[PDB]
Every structure is written in structure tokens, then in C-alpha cells.
Design a protein around this ligand. Sequence first.
Ligand SMILES: N[C@H](CNC(=O)C1=[SH]CC(Cc2ccccc2)=C1)C(=O)O
Length: 288
Amino acid sequence: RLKIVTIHQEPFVYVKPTLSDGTCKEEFTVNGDPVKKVICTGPNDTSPGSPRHTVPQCCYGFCIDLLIKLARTMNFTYEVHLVADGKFGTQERVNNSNKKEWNGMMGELLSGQADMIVAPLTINNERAQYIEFSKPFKYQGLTILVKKGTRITGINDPRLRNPSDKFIYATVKQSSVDIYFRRQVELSTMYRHMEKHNYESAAEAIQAVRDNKLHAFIWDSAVLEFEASQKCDLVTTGELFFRSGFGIGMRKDSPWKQNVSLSILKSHENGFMEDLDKTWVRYQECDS
Ligand SMILES: N[C@H](CNC(=O)C1=[SH]CC(Cc2ccccc2)=C1)C(=O)O
């Protein structure tokens, strides 16, 4: 049985409690089809002070539908869990030494706590040094989320490039967003500003934008465009940048890679990804 690791990230992965009986609530799409749900174990509370308890939860969304298809197509069984530290994955020092390790899903995949990462996981060369990716299952980029009415053009807007305290922007901790900001000369000063204010999760950053505590949130367009389309008070602004894909993650020299990529190819070829888009990404007007 493959150990699949994933992360809470709407609309790709929804995470909800079980009912009192341990079952997942019966739900239907707008088209009337049952929402496919899998059990996923993971931490139930992320609040500072609150104890961690790893409990069965209910998972569903674009990525779970993709998983279900993959497992059928390639004839594997699986069990899903949520990444224990809540992170996508960057490199960090081990015990403040010069040796480095990955945190997040990257870290679990490398340690064997997972066999496959099935998530909105950005393909990039830093991570590709350590793991294999499928071909992209979705093409996307970064964009910026703001409150409706905020006057920002994009990543080269002087309010970002020449920041005062009057305008706070941020991304998510231990995602690939920081290092690619660091590695750019034109964006080094933004990395300096942001590492001070970054959020533990996308959900918390989004909420901070709604609550006027964060003026701009830099994050995946596949996510922010959905969020802004679901919430009438939030918008995205500027051109996509750092265009890149989401891929399935596997250990180097995994025997699964070729067949995973072939599955993803078929899904781009035959309308399946577009069907998923129509189920999870664009289907109704804002209401949340
Ligand atoms: N999906 C999340 C967050 N998204 C990111 O970290 C991103 S999206 C684009 C980007 C930079 C880049 C530049 C060139 C080539 C590839 C990526 C970083 C993750 O996996 O941590």
C-alpha cells in the first residue's frame, strides 16, 4: 500500500472532520454527482498551545479525484495522511549544523514517511535535485491576493519593490516562494520584508487579507484565483509570474514516475483535467 502525503489546500485538498460515527458527510457537486471522499489521518488542531492529536479526517478535492483516478489506472492501493508539520517543504539546517534536510512533504517523501506526494506541489529545480516529479498536472504561477479596491499592479509595483511599513505583504513559510525570491536580484528586498511576516498556512494568510491585517498575499494562482472567485471581497491583481507547474512527487529513480506521467498525459489529452476544473475550480459565483 502506497503512503500518500498531502496538505490542506482548497480547492485541491479539502480537509474536514469525520462525523461522530467516523464517517464522512454525504455531499454532492452542483451537478448532483457524489463528492468522492477518502479518509486522511492528520493533526486536527494547529493552534499554538493546543495539543496535537493525529486523527482520521475526510479529504476531497481536485487532487483527491486525481489520486483516485491514478490508483485505478495504475492498480495500486493507498492510504492518505496530511503532512505532520503542515508544510510544502524547504531545506533547513539539521541541529543548527551545516547539514541540511527537507521539512514538509518533501521531508516525508525523502524519509519514507510517504511514498508519493499528491498535492498542489510546485515543480522546481531546487526540489528536483532531491526528488522526481511527474509532468505537470496543472500549469499555473504566482499571483497576488488583495482586498477589492486595493491599487496594486503586480509584482513590480513600487509599493512592493520599495516597501514602507504602511503596506505589509507576505507568503507562506517553508514553501518554495521564499528561496526563489531570495535567488532573484530584483526581488531580494521583498524576501527581506516578507520572512518577517510570513504565515504558517495559506488559509491564515487569506483570512488576514479579508480582515485587513495583511495588505497583499503572494501565492499560487491556481489557489488565489479560486479563493478570489469564491469570495466577493477578495481579488487577484497583476500578471502571473514565476509560471510553473504542479506535479506528483516521488523519490529519485522511483519505478512509478513513468507511469504516473503517462496517466497525467492521458488526463490532459482526454478532457479529464478540464472536467476536474469544472468540478473544483470554476462552477459558480462568489458566495463565501
Ligand atoms: N505550491 C506551493 C507554493 N508555490 C511555490 O512555492 C512557488 S510557485 C512558483 C514558484 C517559483 C518558481 C520559479 C521558477 C520555477 C519554478 C518555481 C514557487 C509549494 O509547492 O510550495
